Amino acid sequence: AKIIGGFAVSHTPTIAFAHDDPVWAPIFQGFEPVKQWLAEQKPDVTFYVYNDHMTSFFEHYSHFALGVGEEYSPADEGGGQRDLPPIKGDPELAKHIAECLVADEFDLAYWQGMGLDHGAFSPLSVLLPHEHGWPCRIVPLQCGVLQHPIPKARRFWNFGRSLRRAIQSYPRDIKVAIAGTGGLSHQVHGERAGFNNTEWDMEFMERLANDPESLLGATVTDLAKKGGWEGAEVVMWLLMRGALSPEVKTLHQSYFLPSMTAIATMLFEDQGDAAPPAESDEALRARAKRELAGVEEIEGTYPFTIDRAVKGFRINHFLHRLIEPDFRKRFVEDPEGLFAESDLTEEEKSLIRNRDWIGMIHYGVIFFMLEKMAAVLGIGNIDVYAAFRGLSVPEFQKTRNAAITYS
Amino acid sequence: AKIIGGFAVSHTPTIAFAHDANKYDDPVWAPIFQGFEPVKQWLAEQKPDVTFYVYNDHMTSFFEHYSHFALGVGEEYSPADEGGGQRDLPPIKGDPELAKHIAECLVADEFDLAYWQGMGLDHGAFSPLSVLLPHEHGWPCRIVPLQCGVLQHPIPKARRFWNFGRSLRRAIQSYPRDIKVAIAGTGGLSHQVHGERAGFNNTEWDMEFMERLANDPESLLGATVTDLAKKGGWEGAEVVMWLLMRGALSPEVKTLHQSYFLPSMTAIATMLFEDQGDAAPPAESDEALRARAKRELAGVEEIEGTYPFTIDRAVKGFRINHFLHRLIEPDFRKRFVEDPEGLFAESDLTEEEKSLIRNRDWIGMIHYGVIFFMLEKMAAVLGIGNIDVYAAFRGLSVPEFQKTR
Ligand SMILES: O=C(O)c1cc(O)c(O)c(O)c1
Ligand SMILES: [Fe+3]
Ligand SMILES: [Fe+3]
């Protein structure tokens, strides 16, 4: 129901690709006030805010890729699956966060089942215990910051500001953290690969808290030379900061600089809003539900919302692969062999095996994978439609005007 | 820079299937084509350089990562496999240059996007196009595909679509090169293709929606997702793409054409709008908006050894980045080490790009168009560490560079 505090933090895989020495030991002295903070707060969920580094987000690269999944494994980065356990996500808040962001005219993406890169699991292994599982659940906000144009900082900030109200409006009884993992100043590409600027580094750290609203004019240029090209990924801080309350109590403000990348921490504490906001919680939970309000009156109709997508993922994903000429070769030639290898539940295997079109719709299969399945089996859309209507094809064709078939 | 007009058409796979099975001749299907014919001819008469082309992918190229406004920035686009193999249609050229500039302007107008290359276009794009353009060995124009996530709710309010379109018009007019741009919105009208309600139509509503959209579009801007789905079937709610398109056209338009046919499940509809234009003068000027865009990368040229990753860059390096990207697939990277040559010969990579990989040529790759994180992968694959590549970026040696702090 409300947010408690939030941490900024470098995400360099130097933390990963080595640790899991006394040059490092009084830098974990920076990682202590965060690690301590995440055990004597006990967070239900962390709205994690990182950038994928061309690992899971390449060919399709978006600005705000909201993870909505059940859970997240580590991404193979060519250097191997990093030996860590899946961390659980929160579909139920993610759905709610999305609805509010949408009504406030923001533009999102939804993903699931894609591994996490160094932008996440590297500094997130060092800030949490990972024994046989993970302390808590995550809500990952992947940010497109490597392909320009990217959202303006003014924009990034407001997204936080919208998130602020959005999470605060989630009716359920929970306390939520925010991870805005970015930076700090550096550049890892080209001839000028090396530049740092700790005097910008310092002024930045300070200005984030004490006067953030004035940063909202910093062009991509204004963080390019100032703090290296990649170092500009700091816009992910302005959003974390955005959500967190106007005023904050900087429970720790560390900084060193070992290798390639400046490494810094900025844990704050949430207080509360600097005023009761121009729109109530009642006014924002109801509105977030405006576009689909009363859609449950509309019969024989199974809207594809985030909750349905999560339920339908394994099976949606499974029939998705009918696009692949091999997978669809195996699907016709050796379904059982194929299922035996899948991660589908027995009911999921049954729905497919029995060819229960209406069931899959009841279950959460979006029509469009049923479409491909039909095609693969050398059978048309009409068949699937008639099945939906408990009719025989010729009976359904009675309802049409013309009697065409196609796939 | 000249927006000639915009058209609206259904994108049912039944169109494609009628085109492919040459039912052009067939009494059921014949009149439906006579219906496309006036749009076809205008397209052939006006000869637009680029069609900015709005459509929804049908859980094909967008499934696991599903954005709302997915601009297509690529060199060219092919037909997606939809379970039965790619259609017989050559690729269609895109417009990277235009895509970039549009991207700049919408970004400034506080719209969040997505950029993509390489993936197939499904019946959303190719069903209608294959009947409106001659494709008997190229396509007469170029496309800027905009894929809209209208399938997985929450999706943007109908108003955001119109607003995207308005912002798009100026984004296109403000394009400072002299080309003819048509605009396309695809999908609907009434149809529902799922659940027990499937087979639902409403001609009365289709004919209303079409006329409002042509004559009083702002009337439709408060219509909710529940409203549109009750009226035109759940999937007919995709018509929010007709707004977007209509948004980008002159406030008043001249409707040259309309047709309607309901043979099966989908109201197969067509609209052709002649852009009137700046009958009213631009609320904000070309120069000032053009400036509001390039703005964020203002003066960024004057930073040395810094090759930033703009759309034009991602386009240039796509083949090599995609190739390097694939290092995360284990079967591939274990072949990169044992059988590098066999892999290059399998790949569509150029002979330049190839040599750049062989030569473990760190800085020319950054130069060419590769983003670092592709190399950061690549390095870790051959057992070489990160800090080496930085040494080579500086033209220095392993220990020589390690000096700073
Ligand atoms: O069954 C149909 O006519 C149909 C199928 C689709 O997959 C679709 O996107 C559409 O607009 C219509
Ligand atoms: Fe990063
Ligand atoms: Fe569609």
Numbering used by the authors:
A (entry chain A): 2 to 21, 27 to 413
B (entry chain B): 2 to 406
From the paper:
Interestingly, a large shift of the Fe (II) ion was observed in the DesB-gallate complex. The shift of the Fe (II) ion, which seems to be critical to the catalytic reaction, is likely to be induced by the substrate binding at the productive binding site and to cause the strict substrate specificity of DesB. On the other hand, the Fe (II) ion at the A-site is located at a distance of approximately 2 Å from the R-site and coordinates OH and OH of gallate. The crystallographic analysis in this study showed alternative conformations of the Fe (II) ion, R- and A-sites, both in C2221 and P21 crystals. Interestingly, no crystal structures showed 100% occupancy of the Fe (II) ion at the A-site. The observation of the alternative conformation of the Fe (II) ion could be explained by a hypothesis that the shift of the Fe (II) ion is reversible under anaerobic conditions. Analysis of the van der Waals surface around the active site showed that direct coordination between the hydroxyl groups of gallate and the Fe (II) ion at the R-site cannot be allowed due to steric hindrance. For the direct coordination, the Fe (II) ion should be shifted as observed in the DesB-gallate complex. We therefore concluded that the shift of the Fe (II) ion from the R- to A-sites is required for direct coordination between the Fe (II) ion and the substrate. In addition, the catalytic reaction of DesB requires the shift of the Fe (II) ion, leading to the bidentate coordination of the substrate to the Fe (II) ion.
The three catecholic compounds are degraded by three evolutionarily related type II extradiol dioxygenases–DesB, LigAB, and DesZ–in S. sp. SYK-6. On the other hand, DesB exhibits not only a strict substrate specificity but also high enzyme activity for gallate. While LigAB is an α2β2-type tetramer, DesB is a β2-type homo-dimer. In this study, we analyzed the mechanism of the substrate recognition of DesB on the basis of the crystal structures of reaction intermediates.
